[PDB]
């Protein structure tokens, strides 16, 4: 299992604009297009992002290309971030994927706000951190996915996804 497979499980693949659980316009593998209500604003962002007139629809290849970009950008964002970098550096390879997953979903800034959990992860206090991470809107709003990520941080294995 790797970061791409992990996120492909959590986000799914959709080739037509769709709304995410928060109600935002998304396409492909969890690629947020805009927080704006306008489907039109969404279609424009899409064409801008693909470099073609997509008319709200894209090919598998295009979705995978966006995915590669988003993952790369998530990783680089963590590495550039003063709060995130030290945590990342302190984790094993599986747990690193779990932090990338959170960043992909909620952005650098949002994850950077998990001050207390970050601190626990850095100190390698797995169980404590799992319990703190669950006390979030994040967990309450998308509990199945959050549980998967949380279990990854707790155990350091891919058990949560080995099911899936």
From Swiss-Prot:
Catalytic residues in the record: 11 (proton donor/acceptor), 20 (proton donor/acceptor)
Record field: pH dependence: Optimum pH is 7.3.
Keyword Transport among record annotations: no
Entry's induction text: Expressed late in the viral replication.
Cellular compartment(s): Host cytoplasm
GO molecular function: lysozyme activity
EC number: 3.2.1.17
Outcome after substituting residue 26 to H: Facilitates transglycosylation more effectively than hydrolysis; covalently bound substrate
Main subcellular location: host cell
Effect of residue 117 to F: 10-fold decrease in enzymatic activity
GO cellular component: host cell cytoplasm
Signal sequence region: none
Phenotype for residue 11 to N: Loss of 84% of enzymatic activity
Outcome after substituting residue 30 to A: Almost complete loss of enzymatic activity
InterPro entries in the record: Endolysin_T4_type, Glyco_hydro_24, Lysozyme-like_dom_sf, Lysozyme_dom_sf, Phage_lysozyme-like, T4-type_lysozyme
UniProt keyword Hydrolase present: yes
One GO biological process term: defense response to bacterium
Purpose: Endolysin with lysozyme activity that degrades host peptidoglycans and participates with the holin and spanin proteins in the sequential events which lead to the programmed host cell lysis releasing the mature viral particles. Once the holin has permeabilized the host cell membrane, the endolysin can reach the periplasm and break down the peptidoglycan layer.
Protein family (similarity comment): Belongs to the glycosyl hydrolase 24 family.
Protein name: Endolysin
Organism classification: Viruses, Duplodnaviria, Heunggongvirae, Uroviricota, Caudoviricetes
Gene for this chain: E
